[PDB]
Design a binder for this molecule. Structure first.
Ligand SMILES: Nc1ncnc2c1ncn2[C@@H]1O[C@H](COP(=O)(O)OP(=O)(O)O)[C@@H](O)[C@H]1O
Ligand SMILES: Nc1ncnc2c1ncn2[C@@H]1O[C@H](COP(=O)(O)OP(=O)(O)O)[C@@H](O)[C@H]1O
Ligand SMILES: Nc1ncnc2c1ncn2[C@@H]1O[C@H](COP(=O)(O)OP(=O)(O)O)[C@@H](O)[C@H]1O
Ligand code: ALF
Ligand SMILES: [Mg+2]
Ligand SMILES: [Mg+2]
Ligand SMILES: [Mg+2]
Lengths: 54, 466, 157, 479, 454, 128, 128
């Protein structure tokens, strides 16, 4: 009875873990694209601001 | 003395004077307009030309159009005759009820109260909102800021504070609508007329309304908070009496400033903002204050752009406050209202010599358990609570109950919660969190502490759930 | 950053220091996976020196690649070989720390100077498994390897 | 004559610099010899800067420019109904001149506090999920937001098609005139939309303002203000108009292009500091007028396109902070067949509950609570029951395109579900159930439906009646 | 009129005129050079001076040098004589076969068909995976995705090769940022497979190259040149043409580089402020008119693999379908390397393609997404824990995987094996079966790299 | 005045973040072109010349001193950001305080590994 | 010279990242407009015209050839930075090196699952 209860529980557990992970991959991926875009934009605005100020 | 427009770009108008230049801050009047059009002097450009900011739209202006100098800054009606009325940025009636016949007028620009005028008295202002009173309590005569991203609950929280504190407050109130929805201004006005807080027949009104909403051009949104605060100053001083000042939303002052800063010729600072962001903010904020002459309890909704609390606007506002209530979208999306971040809301009055050691020890224990939980979450992210250790299992279950008991149905939100509103007295907010922390309800389900008032309501709801 | 990125091409050896290593109390805070030298070549320093240094880099890089699975699936879920990578890398990390004479006002420890042959030997012995029985804290802030064997005795009371 | 006319000094980067025009007003339309129009934006001591409402290659240095004497304005009236125009109001559908008799400034300030009243009449979309759970009222601003291909435009198109029942009816106060502003969209898409509206016979009460992807940025920037003024014409004359801005993301991109060309300081995502105000002044003009101002209204449904479901970005948050709530659409919901792809829990109508019929009210309430309880659970019979109702209710909210439903039919359908007549059914059979039942009540029980429609509520009798019909339908239901 | 150069700053040239200034977008010809040097007017600076963008190098230019106004924007040869020829952005022959003797010329700048000037159909490729799972529709825009060296271009070549049938078979290939080595290879393959006949007039493809080593104004305008060649076929001769744009990202970057050179302030992520109208003015010209249609296949580079980057994000608003190639598929040996679970169509439904085709396609995605689940367990627990049922889904699936593979005519130079063009008929059929099992005994080879089921 | 007259003084700068912000306003308004983060390119020099004046004098100069405790406000705990590292790069140590420790009851909320003193035990009695 | 006279040459450009830095210095100091990372709008063309000079000639032209191996230095692995994106798109393929592979003992540190050669087998001997 223990093995069936063990394996049933491990499945369910790795299942949640696997879903939590995919959710972590989405937040991170989206964090990554937004940050990459903002770094280029920000660096460029600093360049232009200094250029135009002359 | 009269001048002539030499240039017009949106809200910024240049004006040349052949005789007598108007000093910075003077209100000038454009001739030949159907409705009064004020230009506030901002700079002296040289060559007898000044640079100004318009208080209304500049469509229809022509080069050469005449302008007169009024000889002073924008001046508005102040005093008992503003009560029950609605005024705009230049002090004109916008409620169709005729002239505002005061005896007094006040300039909307003024030096802040000096260091010698500061008061150091600190006393609690109980709101009946559990999360605020427990963790980051408001002070009478103090500065309160409500930070929040778009649609997270700042206005709803303001309206609940008006309902729990104001309505039954000794003195007068001033509500300054700044860059928000005109229809919210129509909602407020109607509700105050329906309750009698505003009376269109007697001299009994208790609130003065000042509005410059999101339909206005930037110069009007950049000055309308000064109009509201000027009305509040008069009641503070010129009566010495305890006024409530609500502003929704003060971020709109700083946003309006960034729209004209470009037209003014400045090199932009970080994030495209005006280089003067912090000193402009400071000259306005330092007048919103309790002084030895009289008290102002101010409550200011503070918008947070792209939900970024590090944006220069919200970030520079923190220093101007005595209590901060920070709302979070994540929390709102979990259905916890009011959506207050219990680990980012603070108060200068949360000191055991002021609120007593029991309030202080319970608030610190709630924050410790919620931070302990936050810290576990970070390590459970993937593997749930199974792998967790029974004692940590106890931090989790308690923290989860505390988070829900911080939720609370507001009288003004019944349509969204489908729950009658609740006001919880200070002593009961303390007892309930004291009990949860002591383990007195480790056997009740989480759900029972959600959306209730006092702790006896969680217990009932527990039975009902069975 | 442009200043330091442009400086790399002017050097023959680099020692890169890291706040993330300093924070753990590992001093000198040298990142062992980002510090390079033009003479780190078997034909220059010899194959023993060269092989030990590369084996130290490999175990430190393999440990770094596992840290975020250990932290999530637990050590028990690791193979036995992966477990040796871990305990040995963590000991090698501490053995790379060292009390400096000019840093006694900061560490509370007497400074040490370790000859090249003693350095090579100590690390070769850890990689080989000779000290799998000693606790980690024994390799922290010492000089020669004999000093870690003695600290292990001290700690054992 | 340098007072009434001028000559182009320079052109490129979209701004025409003009010598002369000494009497031009700020914001006046000016005319280039080529026939293009422009707006006087900057008045300077030695030039006028003009925004060109079209292609600037048709403008050359030395070209003559003349005043019009009028602040930028557009034609307005019932003549625009059934037509397709550009952002200036010229016909582009090939059916001839607009017979307009009145014009209106594109930049008029919205109504103040006094002329308004809180929304209180339903703006029925015909879409079950909206009319029940995110109710929209006449005068309200309700944002439509979500990623590309989630069904944002489709909600709008069904809403427009839905109004035919009222517009072809007697009761004039229930009528709703529609304006669809296409901003930055493909031509072929606008043409496909007009054919769809024409086949549904909805064009006769719709104005289509189009500034598509190859139109110059300033026309795309202008289009929404133009359509808005066309809608205001109804708002101020005791009538009700509905305006869709499809979409404001593209309008803010056209505005950022103009601003950057004017060298205005870029901020977040390189947008100018007045991009919030661009939208705020536009949406404030949707409003509900009290009876002393004629009782008319202008409802707006602005559209915002997110990128990977990020509603915390700058433009989305800006617009969320202007509207009275929003209908959030999600790709995951779409792919799974949850269509319309509306996320119920996150969507909100800040002022529309006061404008929902009692009948819908007497059934949407419990469905809201029942979905609220379900949303938690998605063994143990109880949580297990909640699950059951939730799954059936979700099926009921599914709806195809082009068949907006009359409110009394929606109620009849929601009724089956919240009263339990669907529980003993295969999740797989709710849709077939729902169609068969609707054809039934529609054919054999019009009177009952006419009742619910007329009373605006479900009487004690209509409830008993409906209990019988549904019951006797579920028995014979073969599927 | 004839003007004088007054400034030269890399690829930007300012030209002054005494009388009558050339409007914006006009083509100016520089005098006194060994090869034609066109300047496109971009702005009027005031003081009778125009700012222009060069279409070739500017080394050797002198202040004072004469420049003629052509009186119009860049014009190029259009007509059947463009078929089988190679042309550059300003319409000159670069294949060395002499003059391109058309009877007409066309401006490369053109407004799109008006609101009044414009249903759905299907374009058979003869490529099983596409025609089955994500078929193209005439008149639409199709984005072609794929990592470097995965086969995008090879796929473009087969498409040009297969199109030579039904609605005619004419194609225009616009190489934006074409690598010269590859422009030589594409030419040679077109000749080899016959689509380009150096002997008669049966050529079915016109080539327009905007090469990597050309200045930014030449790379930004070559897609338009290609577009102008195609508009002739659609408009003047009523055809359903195919326009290949490889790659559309480089159209966007060339536009971002010209904008930067003209001193305009960059927008988010460094793109030109006019990103959307630049894309918009080109794409809108690609559409179905009463006179006929233009279908376009556009290879799209995705920066950092971020589909929310502004460039792909703006481009997607104009696509009706996609073809997604994959390296993981190419490396495991299947060509063309299409990911059958990631290609779509703004219009693939039974109402359109017809139950049959539909069902065959959709039945193939379920098997595939079903076989994908069983992969773990097969590799870990062993390809035996599979139930007789699941065990069935696997063999059917693996069989469908390879039936999706296909030997391309243009791939003969690589594998040495013969190519196959598979009719929708023979495609739809063969895939319908699998489920059945008519091939369970049939091994996974009469399925790998074959044409027709038979 | 104390430092140079045989006396000992302690100065607190609360805070230098707000001072850099006021310096950036003045500079942009004087039209000196901004550098990183829109701060003037010598924002480091603003603080380094100031903090260099805190010193310990020898006996021949009277043996007095001036001790400084400048304050910097970080955002979201980012101690390795540009302004913050500029000041760290000037002082003889830093005390870094973190919010997570503060709410855990760790008060003073000192992050030990990220805090340092560059004088060390030379500034402590033998007993400490 | 070798390419055009029936011979074969190999050129290595080590490195092009530095060449683009030198060009940027000149462009910014002549006051041409700065783009992403401050590079000018023709930095793509600077490299594209250099690299299209590598080629394999036909027999009529002598059969000679010029092979190019440009070197690009990335920063923290960013192969999508401006100059890298440019040179990757121009070339026929790329050999990607990675610091993690290098210290793990994979030397040469080539990521063969990501490296590209569009020429491929056409340039290999039958046994290889
Ligand atoms: N205390 C609350 N209880 C329930 N819902 C709330 C509460 N506060 C906000 N909300 C929901 O959020 C919506 C927007 O809130 P509001 O305060 O007006 O936003 P903002 O922060 O933009 O001022 C409300 O209409 C309501 O639906
Ligand atoms: N309720 C629906 N049922 C089925 N298909 C739908 C439904 N709503 C929209 N679609 C389809 O989804 C696709 C995307 O819809 P669309 O309204 O254009 O989205 P968006 O405007 O957000 O890009 C369209 O083909 C549309 O026909
Ligand atoms: N269908 C195919 N059959 C065989 N080899 C192919 C095929 N497609 C591509 N290849 C191989 O891959 C190389 C690169 O293909 P290519 O079309 O240029 O890739 P991409 O355009 O995606 O960069 C070809 O030169 C050849 O070596
Ligand atoms: F509606 Al808000 F801040 F988003 F008041
Ligand atoms: Mg609000
Ligand atoms: Mg749409
Ligand atoms: Mg290719």
């Amino acid at each position: 009875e223990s093995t069936t209860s063990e394996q049933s529980a491990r499945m369910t557990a790795m299942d949640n873990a696997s879903k939590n992970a995919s959710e972590m991959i989405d937040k991170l991926t989206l964090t990554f694209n937004r940050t990459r875009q903002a770094v280029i934009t920000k660096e460029l605005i600093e360049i232009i601001s200094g250029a135009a100020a002359l | 003395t009269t001048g002539r427009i030499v240039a017009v770009i949106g809200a910024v108008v240049d004006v040349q004077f052949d005789e007598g230049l108007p000093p910075i801050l003077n209100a000038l009047e454009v001739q030949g307009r159907e409705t009064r059009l004020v230009l506030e002097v901002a700079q002296h450009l040289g060559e007898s030309t000044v640079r100004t900011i318009a208080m209304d739209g500049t469509e229809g202006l022509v080069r050469g159009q005449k302008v007169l100098d009024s000889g002073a800054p924008i001046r508005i009606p102040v005093g008992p005759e503003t009560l029950g009325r609605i005024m705009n940025v230049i002090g004109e009636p916008i409620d169709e009820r005729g002239p505002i016949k005061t005896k007094q007028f006040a300039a909307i620009h003024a030096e802040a109260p000096e260091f010698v005028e500061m008061s150091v008295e600190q006393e609690i202002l109980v709101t009946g909102i559990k999360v605020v009173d427990l963790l980051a309590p408001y002070a009478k005569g103090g500065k309160i800021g409500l930070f929040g991203g778009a649609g997270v609950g700042k206005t709803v929280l303001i309206m609940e504070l008006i309902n729990n504190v104001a309505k039954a407050h000794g003195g007068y109130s001033v509500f300054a609508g700044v860059g928000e929805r005109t229809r919210e201004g129509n909602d407020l006005y109607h509700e105050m007329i329906e309750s009698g807080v505003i009376n269109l027949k007697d001299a009994t009104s208790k609130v003065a309304l000042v509005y410059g909403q999101m339909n206005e051009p930037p110069g009007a949104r950049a000055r309308v908070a000064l109009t509201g605060l000027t009305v509040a100053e008069y009641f503070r001083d010129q009566e010495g009496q305890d006024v409530l000042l609500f502003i929704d939303n003060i971020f709109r002052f700083t946003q309006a400033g960034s729209e004209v800063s470009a037209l003014l010729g400045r090199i932009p600072s970080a994030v495209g903002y005006q280089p003067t962001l912090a000193t402009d903010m400071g000259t306005m904020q330092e007048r919103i204050t309790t002084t030895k002459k009289g008290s102002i309890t101010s409550v200011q909704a503070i918008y947070v752009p792209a939900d970024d609390l590090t944006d220069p606007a919200p970030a520079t506002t923190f220093a101007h406050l005595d209590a901060t209530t920070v709302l979070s979208r994540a929390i709102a999306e979990l259905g916890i209202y009011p959506a207050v971040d219990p680990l980012d809301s603070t108060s200068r009055i949360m000191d055991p010599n002021i609120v007593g050691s029991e309030h202080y020890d319970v608030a610190r224990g709630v924050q410790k358990i919620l931070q302990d939980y936050k810290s576990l979450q970070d390590i459970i992210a993937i593997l749930g609570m199974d792998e967790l250790s029974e004692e940590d299992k106890l931090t989790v279950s308690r923290a989860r109950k505390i988070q829900r008991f911080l939720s609370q149905p507001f009288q003004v939100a019944e349509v969204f919660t489908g729950h009658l509103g609740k006001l919880v007295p200070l002593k009961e907010t303390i007892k309930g969190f004291q009990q949860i922390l002591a383990g007195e309800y480790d056997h009740l389900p989480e759900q029972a502490f959600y959306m209730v008032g006092p702790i006896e309501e969680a217990v009932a709801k527990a039975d009902k759930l069975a | 950053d442009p200043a330091p990125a442009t400086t790399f091409a002017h050097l023959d050896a680099t020692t890169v220091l890291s706040r993330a290593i300093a924070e753990l109390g590992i001093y000198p805070a040298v990142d062992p996976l980002d510090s390079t030298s033009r003479i780190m070549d078997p034909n220059i320093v010899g194959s023993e020196h060269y092989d030990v240094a590369r084996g130290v880099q490999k175990i430190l890089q393999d440990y770094k690649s596992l840290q975020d699975i250990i932290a999530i699936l637990g050590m028990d879920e690791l193979s036995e070989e992966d477990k040796l990578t871990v305990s040995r890398a963590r000991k090698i990390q501490r053995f790379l720390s060292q009390p400096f004479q000019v840093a006694e006002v900061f560490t509370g420890h007497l400074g040490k100077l370790v000859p090249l042959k003693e350095t090579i030997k100590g690390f070769q012995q850890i990689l080989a498994g000779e000290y799998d029985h000693l606790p980690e804290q024994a390799f922290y802030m010492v000089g020669p390897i004999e000093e870690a064997v003695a600290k292990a005795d001290k700690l054992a009371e | 004559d340098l007072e009434e006319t001028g000559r182009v000094l320079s052109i490129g980067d979209g701004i025409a610099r003009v010598h002369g025009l000494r009497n031009v007003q700020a914001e006046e339309m000016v005319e280039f010899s080529s026939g293009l129009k422009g707006m006087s934006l900057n008045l300077e001591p030695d030039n006028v800067g003009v925004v060109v409402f079209g292609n600037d290659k048709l403008i050359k240095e030395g070209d003559i420019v003349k005043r019009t004497g009028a602040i930028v304005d557009v034609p307005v009236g019932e003549e625009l109904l059934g037509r397709v125009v550009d952002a200036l109001g010229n016909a582009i559908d090939g059916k001839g001149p607009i017979g307009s008799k009145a014009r209106r400034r594109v930049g008029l300030k919205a109504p103040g506090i006094i002329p308004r009243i809180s929304v209180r009449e339903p703006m029925q979309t015909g879409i079950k999920a909206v009319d029940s759970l995110v109710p929209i009222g006449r005068g309200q601003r309700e944002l439509i937001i979500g990623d590309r291909q989630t069904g944002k435009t489709s909600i709008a198109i069904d809403t427009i098609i839905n109004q035919k029942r009222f517009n072809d009816g007697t009761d004039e106060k229930k009528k709703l005139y529609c304006i669809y502003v296409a901003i930055g969209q493909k031509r072929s898409t606008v043409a496909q939309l007009v054919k769809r509206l024409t086949d549904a016979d909805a064009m006769k009460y719709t104005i289509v303002v189009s500034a598509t992807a190859s139109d110059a940025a300033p026309l795309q920037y202008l289009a929404p203000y133009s359509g808005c003024s066309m809608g205001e014409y109804f708002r101020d004359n005791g009538k009700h108009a509905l305006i869709i801005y499809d979409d404001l993301s593209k309008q803010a991109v056209a505005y950022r292009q103009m601003s950057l060309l004017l060298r205005r300081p870029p901020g977040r995502e390189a947008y100018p500091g007045d991009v919030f105000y661009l939208h705020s002044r536009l949406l404030e003009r949707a409003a509900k007028m009290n009876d002393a101002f004629g009782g008319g209204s202008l409802t707006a449904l602005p559209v915002i396109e997110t990128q990977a479901g990020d509603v915390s970005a700058y433009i989305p948050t800006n617009v969320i902070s202007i509207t009275d709530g929003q209908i959030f659409l999600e790709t995951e919901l779409f792919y799974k067949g949850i269509r319309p792809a509306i996320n119920v829990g996150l969507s909100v109508s800040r002022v529309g509950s006061a404008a929902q019929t009692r009948a819908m009210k007497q059934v949407a309430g419990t469905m809201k609570l029942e979905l609220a309880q379900y949303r938690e659970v998605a063994l143990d019979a109880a949580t297990q029951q909640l699950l059951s109702r939730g799954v059936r209710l979700t099926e009921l909210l599914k709806q195809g395109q082009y068949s907006p439903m009359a409110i009394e039919e929606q109620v009849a359908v929601i009724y089956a579900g919240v009263r339990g007549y669907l529980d003993k059914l295969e999740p797989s059979k709710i849709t077939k159930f729902e169609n068969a039942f609707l054809s039934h009540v529609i054919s054999q029980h019009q009177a009952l439906l006419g009742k619910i429609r007329t009373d605006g509520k479900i009487s004690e009798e209509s409830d008993a009646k409906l209990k019988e019909i549904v019951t006797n339908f579920l028995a014979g239901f073969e599927a």
